[PDB]
Design a protein around this ligand. Structure first.
Ligand SMILES: Nc1nc2c(ncn2[C@@H]2O[C@H](COP(=O)(O)OP(=O)(O)NP(=O)(O)O)[C@@H](O)[C@H]2O)c(=O)[nH]1
Ligand SMILES: [Mg+2]
Lengths: 997, 130, 11, 206
């Protein structure tokens, strides 16, 4: 349309056309807006658009247009400044300075266009980063001078200085070379005395709130880096902690300044400093008490009301109090005259800890952890805080979150455990009283009984066994009566669940009271027939949890019993689990396997195992007899689900028994692999008859579940096996014969990535014992899986991940399998590794970089032999250049550290002459040229063509440094990051690469 | 002595069936199914007309993702990839504004929830036949 | 402990 | 009653997928990088009436950044997004925040850690502290599982309207119309295709 006229640079820029495009983008909508956006982007991305910025800034009446003009200038200053003719550099500086002065002088502009002025200030700062001080030594003196002649200019100079400090000290690490960052830090540090003088004069004398606030905002930045003497040898702490805490305009920024002050580097042997540190805290707390709110105030309610900036203020007060007290509270702990201050500060924190705000609670909770840990270890401190700790007990107990929010529960548990050790009597009393108000109904609610139950469970192990015993009794007695008293399964379910939760948290109590433990389990078994939502899950979860902690008491014969209780559980398992869902049945069997593995008499353990598996083994025999006599059954979804659940039961028990599971595995192994084959050909037949869409059908998904569960069973056992001779001689060969060809000869959409995962475990555990088997694995999965994943980075995501895990372990444990590869296949292996480099997916990328590193090491270990020499001739520079590519292309930042490690190993091979042949071709350099010289030459040429805007000097200095530093990973990395900065601009200083030296 | 003391459009309907479900719409131009919402699917019987509709709202935001009469001409069909879903053409759904036609798929937590939805769906068609 | 009558717990 | 919201963060963190979920209910599995910005109106119904967010969904990849901080002008709220499976995206949160608040000096901002549905989380909850000193609201979210997916907008609505008790409510549900044999063969074609295209994510609980 018409709007595209600004894109035609052969004409003069119609400024009114620019403003129309900008208005349509910012204030317009829909299709119009979108067109304008695409035009504006094309405009500012024109490499000549900066030439028209001085027009826009002079003659536009639209502040958005000028903002975009400054963005265009920013790109130029940041990337191409040093390529400009020097006259344009001076011209751009002068234009930007003048524009800022003029905007400051017009009070209407100064108040109405803060966004445009802030952008101009930032553009100025970009110029300073290029020009100052070496080409602009007077900037700071003239800034200080101009500040005195105008409040607006002075205020704006505080913004400029704030941004300069941010750009030099807070955001330089990843955007400048090490040398340039140091140069600017030293330059600011050299002239900060004069800057501070202006800043302190403004704070002492000024009356313009807006100027004061800007000065304090810049002070906040300075506190990140300035020497402590500017804070402690001036009166600035007094001003911060009194004058500026009184007006709310300055209060927010001042508090943030004082928080950073609480983090300055200060000598800890100076008594004057210590009193100053006490004093500014005392002043601040006094101002809060008299100007904001007293310590008794309900901060929970204030925060909830969310008036004005109250929420940010209370957040900032929490940060101030916790930061200062974590560092300095010892200063307040010995002087009786500071005791009130110490406790008032902590009382504010108590009140802050009642606010309903998860992230703020975590901030205060981290501090409480710091406090109560110190009271637990440090002599003569806990009595000071007795009343604070008592209140904290109630706060934590009442805000306990669900354990089974994982991180927050663990932090709360930790604090409460400390608080229990500090005063066990007070903790018990609070919890009992709390339980009474659940019974009297005054604080009764589903939520409230739950949180109290979690709190009670969380302190298990802190009381003596005698005190624990009558505490647990009291709690359960009260909880039982509470459940009696309520009506409806809703309430009774909630309370019975909490009872089982508490019980499960006190295994020490269960192990000492067998009859009670028996009653619990039998009650859980009862609850496994209760269909009210949640009860059965709760029952099974509590069962396995109690078992994990008390298994020994199920496997011995307890006095007054006829048999170990595990026998009684097994005898009645059919009725016990009759009403459970399969997933819950498997948990039950897993719990039984935990117990059975505690039996170390082998004949008894194996009898228990075969008895436990009686029902699945009989179902199994039946289906094996049937399904073998009629493969059609396997299309009956009912038979498929039965089969899968049998195998899942075996997985569950094998999970808890590991090596002990072997006898049960032997009962089913050979027929299970025959079932694998029968299901496999059923899947293939369906895909033949119906197409690829068959893999989505329930029938085939069910069949593949069987295959996956069989593989998971074998993986689970082999990962835990202790007799590896049996693994190799009995399990592996039937396994490979059953799974490898089926995988290779299925179409891609029918191959189970789980095959790769299972093979990864085989190689891990016994790879060293089956070299021919590893070769067979590679032959059957390597090329066909690679072809699935080497066309994009997205298809077959699970095969992708498992593929590189398998290659990684093969490269670790049976590298000889890659040696036997025919040369065309070894080349595919190298391509596969580099392909992995180029993934953004961390799973693949990390393994790809590690395989590369491990491979180099494997080759190095071979010594000076033909395969190793051919490897370097064929692939050394491929690995060097592919590593450099992902290091420098800005799309693989997540792998920087491992790319650098790989690159460093590669370069060090050459500079230790661990490569025994020339890396160059016959007549490419004189006879006798060292690989060192050739490597430098190859890299110089590579970087020159890849980054043509670098000077030869830049490249040569970078490579000289990188080469010298190839034993020092930290420094090597610094030099790589310096190179990544320099390739983003023109004219980088080649002496930057001498920084480490 | 008297002391003065201190100072959705579903309400006219009956809930016949309620079930949790995920609802898809078919983008024929992209040849793919797209999720439209997860939440409670309700069959609502107007007290005045006895006409039953499907009304489904997303969790949390409560935004309408299905609102249309259970027309007697509709037909629930299985999807090739699911034993717990139904597919059917809808001629006039007003969840997002002007009455639009859609090919919907609705999936449930279990095959038996799906079969029951089908039962209730067809009972509701009978009611709308009158 | 045996005084606790947990076997009576009901839902 | 509309508010400009800018959504920023590293490429691939889920900004566009998050907005799409809110706009249509769909979950887009494909990564199509945003070019510059896409603007989408988004309305929520509340007990204080409807609130309209004009969402400026910006590009996170540098080479597609477009006007970059030019998009932030006059924003009234923002969401900063990162991916809890990618540490670098958290390391860059301070850089996005810096560029944002230099233009928007005093606006409510939500920080969102996306993709918590992925088991192998890399940015541990304990590591996430940047919001504390910057007064940002933080939420774990997942556009895929919808975990906390409404919280950023609810919290922003509360700040923008100044009502801490504002709630989302059920948009009214108008009676739908009762309703052609000339398109009986054409709807049957679209139905055959729809029936033989498998529903996605058939293992999800829904
Ligand atoms: N597992 C999971 N994946 C997600 C989630 N959110 C988004 N994704 C996926 O992450 C990828 C990138 O999504 P996208 O919305 O395009 O990210 P973006 O921030 O808009 N990228 P850009 O800044 O370049 O436009 C997509 O494949 C998307 O499906 C999530 O919550 N969980
Ligand atoms: Mg996007």
């Amino acid at each position: 349309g018409s709007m595209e006229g600004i894109l035609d640079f052969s004409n003069d820029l119609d400024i009114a056309l620019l403003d129309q495009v900008v208005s349509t983008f910012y204030q317009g909508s829909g299709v119009q807006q979108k067109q304008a956006q695409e035009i504006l982007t094309k405009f500012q991305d024109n490499p000549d658009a900066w030439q028209k910025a001085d027009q826009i800034l002079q003659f536009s009446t639209n502040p958005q247009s000028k903002f975009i003009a400054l963005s265009i200038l920013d790109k130029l200053i940041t990337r191409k400044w040093k390529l400009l003719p020097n006259d344009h550099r001076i011209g751009i500086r002068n234009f930007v300075v003048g524009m800022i002065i003029s905007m400051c002088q017009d009070d209407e502009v100064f108040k109405t266009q803060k966004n445009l002025i802030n952008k101009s200030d930032l553009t100025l700062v970009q110029i300073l980063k290029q020009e100052w001080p070496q080409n602009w030594p007077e900037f700071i003196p003239e800034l200080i001078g101009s500040s005195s002649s105008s409040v607006n200019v002075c205020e704006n100079n505080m913004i400029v200085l704030k941004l300069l400090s941010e750009e030099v000290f807070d955001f330089s690490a990843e955007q400048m070379t090490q040398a340039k960052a140091l140069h600017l830090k030293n330059s600011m540090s050299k002239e900060f005395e004069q800057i501070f003088k202006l800043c302190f004069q403004v704070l002492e004398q000024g009356s313009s709130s807006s100027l004061i606030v800007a000065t304090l905002e810049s002070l906040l930045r300075y506190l990140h880096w300035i020497p402590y003497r500017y804070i402690y040898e001036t009166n600035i702490l007094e001003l911060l902690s009194t004058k500026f805490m009184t007006s709310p305009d300055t209060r927010a920024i001042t508090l943030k300044c004082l928080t950073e002050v609480s983090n300055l580097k200060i000598p800890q042997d100076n008594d004057l400093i210590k009193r100053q540190t006490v004093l500014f805290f005392q002043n601040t707390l006094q101002q809060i008490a008299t100007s904001v709110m007293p310590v008794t105030a309900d901060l929970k309610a204030t925060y909830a009301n969310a008036n004005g900036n109250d929420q940010s203020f209370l957040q900032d007060l929490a940060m101030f109090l916790t930061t200062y007290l974590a560092r300095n509270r010892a200063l307040l702990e010995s002087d009786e005259s500071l005791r009130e201050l110490l406790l008032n500060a902590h009382q504010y924190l108590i009140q802050l800890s009642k606010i309903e705000e998860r992230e703020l609670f975590k901030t205060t909770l981290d501090y409480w952890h710091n406090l109560v840990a110190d009271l637990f270890y440090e002599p003569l401190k806990k009595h000071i805080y007795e009343e604070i700790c008592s209140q904290l007990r109630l706060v934590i107990i009442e805000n306990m979150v669900r354990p089974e929010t994982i991180q927050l529960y663990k932090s709360e548990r930790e604090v409460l455990v400390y608080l229990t050790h500090l005063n066990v009597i007070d903790t018990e009393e609070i919890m009992i009283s709390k339980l009474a108000r659940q019974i009297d109904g005054s604080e009764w609610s589903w939520h409230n009984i739950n949180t109290l139950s979690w709190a009670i469970g969380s302190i298990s192990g802190t009381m003596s066994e005698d005190t624990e015993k009558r505490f647990v009794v009291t709690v359960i007695k009260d909880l039982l009566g509470l459940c009696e008293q309520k009506r409806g399964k809703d309430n009774k379910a909630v309370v019975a669940s909490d009872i089982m939760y508490v019980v499960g948290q006190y295994p020490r109590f269960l192990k000492a009271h067998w009859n009670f433990l028996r009653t619990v389990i039998l009650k859980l078994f009862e609850f496994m027939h209760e269909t009210h939502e949640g009860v059965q899950d709760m029952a099974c979860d509590t069962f396995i949890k109690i078992v994990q902690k008390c298994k020994y008491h199920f496997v011995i014969q307890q006095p007054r019993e006829s048999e170990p209780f595990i026998q009684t559980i097994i005898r009645d398992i059919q009725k016990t689990t009759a009403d459970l869902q399969p997933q819950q049945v498997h948990t039950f069997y897993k719990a039984c396997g935990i117990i059975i593995s505690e039996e170390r008499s082998v004949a008894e353990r194996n009898r228990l195992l075969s008895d436990l598996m009686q029902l699945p083994n009989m179902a199994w025999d039946t289906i094996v007899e049937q399904s073998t006599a009629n493969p059609t059954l396997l299309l009956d979804s009912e038979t498929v689900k039965i089969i899968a659940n049998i195998i899942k039961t075996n997985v569950a028990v094998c999970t808890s028994m590991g090596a002990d599971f072997y006898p049960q595995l032997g009962h089913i192994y050979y027929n299970m692999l025959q079932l694998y084959r029968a299901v496999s050909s059923m899947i293939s037949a369906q895909v033949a008859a119906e197409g690829l869409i068959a893999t989505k059908t329930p029938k085939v998904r069910g069949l593949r579940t069987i295959k996956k569960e069989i593989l998971k069973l074998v993986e689970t056992y082999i990962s835990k096996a202790r007799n590896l001779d049996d693994v190799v001689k009995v399990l592996v060969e039937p396994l490979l014969n059953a799974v490898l060809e089926d995988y290779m000869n299925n179409v891609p959409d029918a191959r189970d990535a789980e095959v790769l995962n299972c093979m990864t475990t085989v190689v891990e555990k016994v790879g060293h014992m089956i070299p021919q088997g590893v070769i067979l694995i590679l032959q059957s999965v390597f090329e066909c899986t690679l072809d699935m994943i080497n066309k994009d980075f997205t298809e077959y995501p699970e095969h992708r991940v498992e593929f590189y895990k398998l290659l990684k372990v093969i490269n670790e444990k049976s590298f000889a399998a890659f040696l036997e590869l025919p040369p065309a296949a070894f080349k595919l292996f190298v391509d596969a590794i580099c392909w992995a480099f180029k993934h953004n997916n961390r799973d693949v990328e990390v393994n790809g970089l590690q395989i590369a590193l491990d491979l180099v090491k494997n080759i190095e270990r071979m010594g000076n032999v033909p395969f190793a020499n051919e490897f370097h001739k064929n692939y050394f520079f491929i690995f060097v250049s592919e590593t450099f590519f992902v290091l420098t292309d800005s799309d693989h930042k997540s792998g920087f550290s491992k790319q650098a490690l790989l690159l460093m190993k590669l370069i060090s091979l050459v500079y230790d002459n661990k490569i025994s042949v020339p890396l160059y071709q016959e007549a490419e350099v004189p006879q006798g040229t060292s690989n060192q010289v050739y490597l430098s030459q190859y890299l110089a040429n590579m970087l020159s063509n890849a980054f043509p805007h670098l000077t030869s000097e830049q490249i040569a200095s970078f490579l000289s440094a990188l080469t010298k530093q190839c034993k020092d990973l930290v420094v090597f990395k610094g030099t790589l990051r310096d190179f990544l900065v320099q390739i983003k601009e023109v004219g980088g200083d080649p002496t930057d690469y001498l920084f480490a030296e | 002595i008297h002391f003065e003391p201190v100072v959705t459009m579903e309400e006219d309907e009956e809930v016949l069936y309620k079930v949790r479900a995920k609802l898809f719409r078919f983008d024929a131009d992209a040849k793919e199914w797209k999720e439209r919402g997860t939440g409670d699917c309700k069959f609502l019987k107007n007290k005045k007309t006895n006409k039953v509709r499907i009304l489904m709202r997303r969790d949390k935001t409560l935004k309408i993702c299905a609102n249309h009469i259970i027309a007697p001409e509709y037909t629930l069909k299985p999807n090739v990839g699911s034993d717990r879903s139904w597919v059917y053409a809808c001629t006039a759904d007003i969840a997002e504004g002007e009455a639009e036609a859609f090919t919907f798929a609705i999936r449930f937590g279990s095959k038996e929830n799906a079969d029951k939805f089908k039962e209730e769906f067809e009972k509701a068609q009978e009611i709308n036949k009158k | 402990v045996d005084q606790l009558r947990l076997e009576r717990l009901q839902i | 009653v509309q508010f400009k919201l800018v959504l920023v963060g590293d490429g691939g963190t889920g900004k566009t997928t998050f907005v799409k979920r809110h706009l249509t209910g769909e979950f887009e599995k494909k990564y199509v990088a945003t070019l510059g910005v896409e603007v989408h109106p988004l309305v929520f119904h509340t007990n204080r009436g409807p609130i309209k967010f004009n969402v400026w969904d910006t590009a996170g990849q540098e080479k597609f950044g477009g006007l970059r901080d030019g998009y932030y002008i006059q924003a009234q709220c923002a969401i900063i997004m990162f991916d809890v499976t990618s540490r670098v995206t958290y390391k860059n949160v301070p850089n996005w925040h810096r560029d944002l608040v230099r233009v928007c000096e005093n606006i409510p901002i939500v920080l969102c850690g996306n993709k918590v549905d992925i088991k192998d989380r890399k940015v541990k909850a304990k590591s996430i502290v940047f919001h504390r000193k910057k007064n940002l609201q933080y939420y774990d979210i997942s556009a895929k599982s919808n975990y906390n997916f409404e919280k950023p907008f609810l919290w922003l609505a509360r700040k923008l309207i100044g009502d801490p008790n504002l709630e989302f409510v059920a948009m009214p549900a108008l009676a739908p119309p009762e309703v052609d044999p000339a398109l009986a063969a054409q709807y049957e074609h679209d139905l055959e295709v729809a029936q033989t295209t498998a529903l996605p994510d058939e293992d999800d609980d829904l």
